[PDB]
Design a protein around this ligand. Structure first.
Ligand code: NA
Length: 330
């Protein structure tokens, strides 16, 4: 089997991407944030505290003939941005882009933090990291990918995120029409439960490539590119008037600037992030200070190749017995 679904930016900045997901019988379609940095599939639901719901579409298990309470199971998750959610668990039929899993754990939120409530466009998350990170207790649950894997034509999924445009998540196949050149594969460590890999270096604009190992994660659920402070300083030093602002919470730059590209290494291959991808616009409405898309990972404890990096590439998440990542230009 295979599946193929379009993923759409939630706003003009590509802050996140939503993908429609069918849950239950008859189908209830919710728009979920596919997150390769976490391992829970959780939804706004008929159980979510009413004051914490503001515009989201909810899953109502009582209206699904295939829903079953997973008795005694609870979940609770905290993300890198300080957001959180928790609740109970149902199993139900879940389909993505025509690929169906029966018996998928659907984590129903009883509580969500303010950042979720305030984002009316995201109805929940679909985690695509390794199932070792799944938070269901007392019986850990599998991701949608891990449950689908054995049925797929190939044990893979691909992320093809757009810049200010829709893109695609495919399951079970490589679309050889969706990228240019060849795919470079690189080793993955699953020790922390992430798609963790090592970039071979970077360049700023037209500058020379610096060969240096950068360990980080491929995380579709993180907006920005978080890298070591040395790398980030070297990037922003090429932008007149850029500075790190403790009041704003990272590097800002004059909205009048033209940003340089940023290149990262994948083995001997190179992925180029155009400068425009690094502009996250005014820090507040009408400001002439703009927020940067490359930020320091110092204090986060891991480097994160978030959407800024991933949307410059066609990315293969190879879930074979020995997982690997692939990157191609597009
Ligand atoms: Na922000």
């Amino acid at each position: 089997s295979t599946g193929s679904a379009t993923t759409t930016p939630i706003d003009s900045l590509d802050d996140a991407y939503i993908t429609p997901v069918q849950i239950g019988t008859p189908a209830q379609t919710l728009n979920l944030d596919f997150d390769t940095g976490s391992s829970d599939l959780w939804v706004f639901s008929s159980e979510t505290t009413a004051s914490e719901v503001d515009g989201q579409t909810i899953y109502t298990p009582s209206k699904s003939t295939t829903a079953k309470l997973l008795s005694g199971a609870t979940w609770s998750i905290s993300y890198g941005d300080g957001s959180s959610s928790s609740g109970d668990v149902y199993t139900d039929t879940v389909s993505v882009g025509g690929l169906t899993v029966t018996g998928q754990a659907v984590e129903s939120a009883k509580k969500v933090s303010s950042s979720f409530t305030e984002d009316s466009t995201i109805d929940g998350l679909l985690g695509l990291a390794f199932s070792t990170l799944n938070t269901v207790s007392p019986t850990q649950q599998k991701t949608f990918f891990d449950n689908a894997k054995a049925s797929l034509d190939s044990p893979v999924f691909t992320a093809d995120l757009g810049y200010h445009a829709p893109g695609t998540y495919n399951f079970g196949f490589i679309d050889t029409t969706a990228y240019t050149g060849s795919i470079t594969y690189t080793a993955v460590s699953t020790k922390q439960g992430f798609w963790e890999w090592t970039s071979t270096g970077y360049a700023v604009g037209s500058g020379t490539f610096k060969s240096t190992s950068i360990d980080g994660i491929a995380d579709t659920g993180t907006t920005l590119l978080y890298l070591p402070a040395t790398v980030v300083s070297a990037y922003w030093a090429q932008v007149s008037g850029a500075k790190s602002s403790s009041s704003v919470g990272g590097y800002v730059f004059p909205c009048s600037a033209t940003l340089p590209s940023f290149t990262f290494g994948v083995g001997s291959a190179r992925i180029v992030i155009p400068g425009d991808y690094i502009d996250f616009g005014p820090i507040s409405t009408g400001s002439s200070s703009c927020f940067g898309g490359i930020q320091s990972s110092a204090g986060i404890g891991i480097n994160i190749f978030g959407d800024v990096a991933l949307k410059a590439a066609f990315v293969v998440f190879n879930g074979a017995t020995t997982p690997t990542l692939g990157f191609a230009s597009k």
